[PDB]
Design a protein around this ligand. Structure first.
Ligand SMILES: COc1cc(-c2nn([C@H]3CC[C@H](N4CCN(C(C)=O)CC4)CC3)c3ncnc(N)c23)ccc1NC(=O)c1cc2ccccc2n1C
Ligand SMILES: [Ca+2]
Length: 434
């Protein structure tokens, strides 16, 4: 028998799922991936619950200050997000020391501003934890209660835990293929050669984007094969692909990203208020999604700001992954234009142009040059001059992407690693403490 507990409020919106509240306890009756069957000790109702809205009784995940499966850089992003303050913190799964934990504290720096500092939490055997060997605690809870009442060593004392909203709710159980009836496509957002994109609703209570496809030479099953594999290639930095409408014309349902395309956002008012450190972060998140594609030996084919979507939180997500397979010369590498050889390295090139896009708020690549004009300049070894506000070192990342020889372009795994830590000397990643 296995008891879990509710981490947030949840109001049921489907036929058989249960409403519950933060603190509600439940018996687990099935583990069927994203949705679990459970009986509410509160209500006695048997029904479905999001597995990510609940965790096992008194396991650390129940603690307000604890965050499972967070990398060092997400911990930094989460902490720096609106609604946290000086001294905000979390304990989390240490990324580079398996089976261990790390403290992240929000701090302010006179000569740099708002930062996050990371401390390893130490534990061998014995049982307890310390960050400095003179100060030992038997549990993580005591650890935080100490550093909450004065910092004894650290760069900041701990106030309140890092804030966090409800997880996106998972998509409906057993709903990969959904009838068209289930959708109300409410507002047409865009319209191209290939289909349209609408803001729609799924079954009254879920906001989604829907791409509707004009029937090409691209076959029906042919298309679903691809969608089907793509839906398995889930990653935080790729747009969430929820369901498919199998019967022509095909519809594709993804999560709705409140701020639309990155290209739109940079050009938007809120866009143009964004400082460079934030612009590089976006870069890093895109590099992170592309690092994942890279690792799985795929290829995107159509990288550019117009195929990156931005959530209401300013998370960046790659869109159109896989679709470009099933179906703009300024973002495309010479090998790809001239002989049509698209590889991850031609992707690295386009990433290069995207960097330029981001750093210049969505201005067209090669402004004033036409397509033909551009193809020639490249041949003659030309590259875009460094814009104003572009750091020198970021300009060289771009230059490295635009190598003529593809095999001398960096890997995304590298680009990502440099961008993530663009403002931190390695030696400084973690804070030593005496
Ligand atoms: C629902 O499916 C998709 C939807 C979007 C999408 N576009 N828009 C805006 C972006 C800015 C646009 N802007 C408006 C303003 N504008 C103008 C000119 O006015 C310029 C244009 C308007 C539309 C969004 N806004 C919020 N949420 C979204 N999801 C989107 C992108 C890709 C897919 N599809 C796939 O990702 C996909 C297909 C696919 C197919 C097969 C396999 C896998 C597949 N995948 C993962
Ligand atoms: Ca260090």
């Amino acid at each position: 028998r296995i008891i879990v507990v509710a981490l947030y409020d949840y109001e049921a919106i489907h036929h058989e799922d249960l409403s519950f509240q933060k603190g509600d306890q439940m018996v687990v009756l099935e583990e069927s991936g994203e949705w679990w069957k459970a009986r509410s000790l509160a209500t006695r109702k048997e029904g479905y619950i999001p597995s990510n809205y609940v965790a096992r009784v008194d396991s650390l995940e129940t603690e307000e200050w604890f965050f499972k499966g967070i990398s060092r850089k997400d911990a930094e992003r989460q902490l720096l997000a609106p609604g946290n303050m000086l001294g905000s913190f979390m304990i989390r799964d240490s990324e580079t020391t398996k089976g261990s934990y790390s403290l992240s504290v929000r701090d302010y720096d006179p000569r740099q501003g708002d930062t996050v500092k990371h401390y390893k939490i130490r534990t061998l055997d014995n049982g307890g934890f310390y960050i400095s060997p003179r100060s030992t605690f038997s549990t993580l809870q005591e650890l935080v209660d100490h550093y909450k009442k004065g910092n004894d060593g650290l760069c900041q004392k701990l106030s309140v835990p890092c804030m966090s909203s409800k997880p996106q709710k998972p998509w409906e159980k057993d709903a990969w293929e959904i009838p068209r009836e289930s959708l109300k496509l409410e507002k047409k957002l865009g319209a191209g050669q290939f289909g349209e994109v609408w803001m729609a609703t799924y079954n009254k209570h879920t906001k989604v984007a829907v791409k509707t496809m004009k029937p090409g030479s691209m076959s029906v099953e042919a298309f679903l094969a691809e969608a089907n594999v793509m839906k398995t290639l889930q990653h935080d930095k790729l747009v969430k692909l929820h369901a498919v409408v199998t019967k022509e014309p095909i519809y594709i349902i993804t999560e709705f990203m409140a701020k639309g395309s990155l290209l739109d956002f940079l050009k938007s008012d809120e866009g143009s208020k964004q400082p460079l450190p934030k612009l590089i972060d976006f870069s890093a998140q895109i590099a992170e999604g592309m690092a994942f594609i890279e690792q799985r030996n795929y290829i995107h084919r159509d990288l550019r700001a117009a195929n990156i979507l931005v959530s209401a939180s300013l998370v960046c997500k790659i869109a159109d992954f896989g679709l470009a397979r099933v179906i703009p010369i300024k973002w495309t590498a010479p090998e790809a234009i001239n002989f049509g050889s698209f590889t991850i390295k031609s992707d690295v090139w386009s990433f290069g142009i995207l960097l330029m896009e981001i750093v210049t708020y969505g201005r067209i690549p090669y402004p004033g040059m036409s397509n033909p004009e551009v193809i020639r300049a490249l041949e003659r070894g030309y590259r875009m001059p460094r814009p104003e506000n572009c750091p020198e070192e970021l300009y060289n990342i771009m230059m490295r992407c635009w190598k003529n020889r593809p095999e001398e372009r960096p890997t995304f795994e590298y680009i990502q690693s440099v961008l993530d830590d663009f403002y931190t000397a390695t030696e400084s990643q973690y804070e030593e403490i005496p």
